[PDB]
Design a protein around this ligand. Structure first.
Ligand SMILES: C[C@@H]1NC(=O)N[C@@H]1CCCCCC(=O)O
Ligand SMILES: C[C@@H]1NC(=O)N[C@@H]1CCCCCC(=O)O
Ligand SMILES: C[C@@H]1NC(=O)N[C@@H]1CCCCCC(=O)O
Ligand SMILES: C[C@@H]1NC(=O)N[C@@H]1CCCCCC(=O)O
Lengths: 120, 121, 121, 120
């Protein structure tokens, strides 16, 4: 299922536990950006997905502050888990940096990350 | 913290009750005015618990999976934004709403938008 | 058409002069108030030239590459939105700004935002 | 270069001409959605990209109306062209449908398309 260790196309590591009632909890390590070591993540997922072959909707957040660095930014990933032989989490994400009100127009990056359980 | 903690409404008439923990945790409950949903949903998120003191906003994000004891939309929204404090406190966000889809329909699985939250006294 | 055609400003103070052609073409010129840019830039786009008469907006989009005779930011913005006609005409958009990057930096190549355009008499 | 026939991961066909001064002009055929046959596209690209190995920024629009169908919607793709042995156009896109003002909150889909010159 969702619980396990995942890796995206950047080489980032996503270690997540899926709770019975819809909680996502875990640890993120990014291969890129103003960051080092582990960061706390929390999110939610659909704990009773539809039985028609549809993916499982989910989302999580990392605020990019830990004991080593603070980038003054946070990323949310929104996506779906697709099970089967080669499980995937396909996401699109938003990274917002803290900015002045005048710089808010350029505060948010958008991207997409695909996660698999295969180590780089 | 006490700044983020409280009751917020957005331009749709949705309501967001949140507690900002000392460790960077956001926890609480969301009621949407719109969509395939009713009653309260669990929210969880993170925020920068040591922001820049330079008049920059405080980065944060949270997610809601649209399943509670009453309804399941098979979808989830993440909001990514910043808290701007002061007398007229705001949380300015962009969001992604992803629905569970079949592989054939995954290309149209995700909506994008923007919500502005005003804190309620 | 004559509805879309004209001069528009957004909440940044940017200006958008456009002509909507009978064939669905949008053509004109954009001045941004912000970013790595100055003077006028070429815009080109498309719009639904036979929209629903049901009080739905008119879907459209346009792009600007931020290169003119004066400056090159090595970037381009696309706006995707709808025109809402009437006495207080608006074009409501979401946009993506992509900068040319090296492969190592492609993950942070794209900004997202939202602009509201008001038509000027 | 950019001029040529491209295909994305959905099987859509993108036939584009890149003009000397930054114009993109061409024809789009989609493998998915409320659409059939060719649609007109126009866009722009950076006609003097940086000489440091960076991709070429670009964007284009299709309004999903032709002689066969009208979906009352338009898509913009924003991205960069990456040249070399296996050229790519990597994009993220926004699809806005015409809606009432009250339904505007759910009017815009976001996604990502990767284009190559390889026929399906
Ligand atoms: C979202 C992207 N995917 C990923 O695995 N890491 C990127 C995010 C890194 C951000 C680091 C904090 C910063 O530079 O602001
Ligand atoms: C993100 C939008 N802002 C908001 O307050 N609610 C909208 C989301 C509602 C979605 C309800 C479940 C569904 O329809 O999929
Ligand atoms: C899309 C935003 N809205 C707007 O009027 N201009 C902004 C874009 C300006 C970008 C200028 C070139 C650059 O900085 O890359
Ligand atoms: C952007 C997606 N990529 C693609 O090649 N086609 C999709 C768009 C199809 C939209 C068809 C019109 C509609 O259904 O509204």
């Amino acid at each position: 299922g969702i619980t396990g260790t995942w890796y995206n196309q950047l080489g980032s590591t996503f270690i997540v536990t899926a709770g019975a009632d819809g909680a996502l909890t875990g640890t993120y390590v990014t291969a890129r950006g103003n960051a080092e070591s582990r960061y706390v993540l929390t999110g939610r997922y659909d704990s009773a997905p539809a039985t028609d072959g549809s993916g499982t909707a989910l989302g999580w957040t990392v605020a990019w502050k830990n004991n080593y660095r603070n980038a003054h930014s946070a990323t949310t990933w929104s996506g779906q888990y697709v099970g089967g032989a080669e499980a995937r989490i396909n996401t699109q994400w938003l990274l917002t940096s803290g900015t002045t009100e005048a710089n808010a127009w350029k505060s948010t990056l958008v991207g997409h990350d695909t996660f698999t359980k295969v180590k780089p």
